[PDB]
Amino acid sequence: HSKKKCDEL
Amino acid sequence: GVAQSPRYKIIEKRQSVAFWCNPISGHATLYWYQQILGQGPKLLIQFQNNGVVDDSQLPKDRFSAERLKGVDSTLKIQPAKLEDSAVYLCASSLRGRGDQPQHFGDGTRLSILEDLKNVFPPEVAVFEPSEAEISHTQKATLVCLATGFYPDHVELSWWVNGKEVHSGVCTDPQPLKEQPALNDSRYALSSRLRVSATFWQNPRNHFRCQVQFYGLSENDEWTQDRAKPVTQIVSAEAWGRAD
Amino acid sequence: GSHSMRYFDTAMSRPGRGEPRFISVGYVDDTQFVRFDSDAASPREEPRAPWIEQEGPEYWDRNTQIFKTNTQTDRESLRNLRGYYNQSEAGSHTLQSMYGCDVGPDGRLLRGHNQYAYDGKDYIALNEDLRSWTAADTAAQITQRKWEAARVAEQDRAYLEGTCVEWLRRYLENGKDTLERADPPKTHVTHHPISDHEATLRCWALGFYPAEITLTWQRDGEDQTQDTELVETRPAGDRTFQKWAAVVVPSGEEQRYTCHVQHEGLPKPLTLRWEP
Amino acid sequence: MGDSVTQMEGPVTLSEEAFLTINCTYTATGYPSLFWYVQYPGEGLQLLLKATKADDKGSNKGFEATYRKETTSFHLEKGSVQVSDSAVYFCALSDPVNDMRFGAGTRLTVKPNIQNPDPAVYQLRDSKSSDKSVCLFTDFDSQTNVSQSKDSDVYITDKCVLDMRSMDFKSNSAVAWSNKSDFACANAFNNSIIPEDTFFPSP
Amino acid sequence: IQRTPKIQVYSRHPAENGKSNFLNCYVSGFHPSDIEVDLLKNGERIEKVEHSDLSFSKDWSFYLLYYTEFTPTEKDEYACRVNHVTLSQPKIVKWDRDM
Ligand code: NA
After folding, report:
1. CATH number of D118's domain
2. Is residue C25 located within the same domain as residue C76?
3. What domain count does chain D have?
4. Which intervals of the chain are annotated as region Alpha-1 (chain C)?
């Protein structure tokens, strides 16, 4: 399952 | 907090309507919800910055939404249908992010009417407290009565000596249909303001009931005998009496 | 047989717009199961793997939503990274993310991965404890302070310890025959003359799975891991792999040299020799 | 994945100072975050309390709901329930991969405890011109319910709670009216089951 | 920031002069992702060239596999044409039976 990446660098 | 405009809107069958929303400053994700009058919120469209994440629940035939510059959003309904009469909610999350809660706006109450000539502003009356109550309980109940308005787009408030009052007041949660037989039937709403007999007994005290109606706008077309049933304030006044 | 899931994502800037290309590739051990692409129309190659389409449309719509969310987050990341290194809009850059879990024979987590890279070099990496970060440069320090305040590690740990482990064990059960399998290599030794005084002995391994194998040449029982010409594990267009190892030998001394082969798919490690 | 939240059926009606329990159960794989939302009449939704990590407390304004991983429940509790708590409550579920899902919504209705009830029906005259008047049924106990009349021309409101805060006094009120002219206080609430000790003053 | 590709020219299985096969070409250890690969046997461009889709390894370097139906019968000869930003002129790695 794909991880939710919401926090930008 | 999340800002939404308008608060109330009256539109006819097959006409177009636009809803605007601005999230909390910085919130990257925005959500458009539909809360059917008497149930939970159902997602319409979700945005992460300028782009759409989910729109599987959004019916493409009538509904559309844009967040072109990743800040404020605009939900639009093309040829509107009678079932679309609901409260259109809008929420936002910082990044969202399951641990982050969603922050909701005050919503937009939409009423889709068969005919625009069914719209009527309310008639406001204030009923002075009974002398029997004063002697019996040493308390005085003022009664307000909003009459013959359509639809339920009424906001009632109480004003004493220029100031708004919240202590000792209760307004009907739901209005009463003046004829349960008719579909586009006129509504009636009431409110109570109970004060000590002592306060009512001073003729110096002014009590006013303010009812704010949310009707039609300037852009709306009106071609009938009676005055345009626009967004207006109808009031009733009552001053105290020694006997 | 230990198992591991890993996701390989790339964000590609262009001199026109710092966004156009986004790629997300999912892997279980060595076999691919999911591929997401921004340049793909519209997307047609979705679903992809055979044992992944058994899951309802709610699975696919969620993962399409995750990719779309990630692509907009990557667009923001590509802008922020440019400012850190004082780069221009004329430049085309690459952001890479590598996340996943490592489980044992039972199904319990051992190592949680969440690594990042900017233009080929390591940027920020999640530590084994899953509460601290590792900055690989000066600009990576400012992302660490941004992320520790935002408490990004708390949610990342929660995905790796939960969702990642939960899905990998489910992925294993759905297609045991295609994942739990361990194919041994078809091994053989070949001789090459080259010189009159020298000769080359090559140890071969073909049709094996997973790719992770060991080939070591040794003379007189002593490891010759210096004079070995070991080539990288190359894949085959049928979910199999290939790898060879060569060693320079003096003429007549052929029988002194022996090769050891180690693989999971092998019952006992092979000790090959030049027969003809 | 999962992913569903089930909230307690029908409207919950209680008395003030009573114990509140609103049930909520969820189906989610992994470590999900749980929320309680409150919708007061007129206003939109607002966060009440939250519990993200396993065994997280989460409490606000007397309310409590503990996240128990072992039982998969998130029940809303309050020791001394207030009249001000009468609103629609919603439980929310979200995990690292799933977006926030809402329960059907349980409506709470908190009735006041009338210490010294004194039911009576009074006639209230209009401020501008003695054209019409209303009938006010007030000071009755919370167990007394107000029902609509058989006559279609007679308008009656449902019971309403007003809180005179400074005096620590709460009262139930109902309103009756008709333009029929042959309408009076004594026959206004003839459809409703009213106490025998209801005070009808001389008109 | 720049990394040069490690080209490997091989076949699916060691097939003799006649038997059906697949001619493979594996390019790895290169950064950025931009690469132009077209296998040759022999001279100018062959059509119907299939290719695996782009992914990277533990060390961040990308990899790509280019393959087409082989079926050789001592038919001369080679290879693949690989051009990268790190490369001056397209490098041509010849196909050898025993490598
Ligand atoms: Na004031």
Report:
1. 2.60.40.10
2. yes
3. 2
4. 1-90
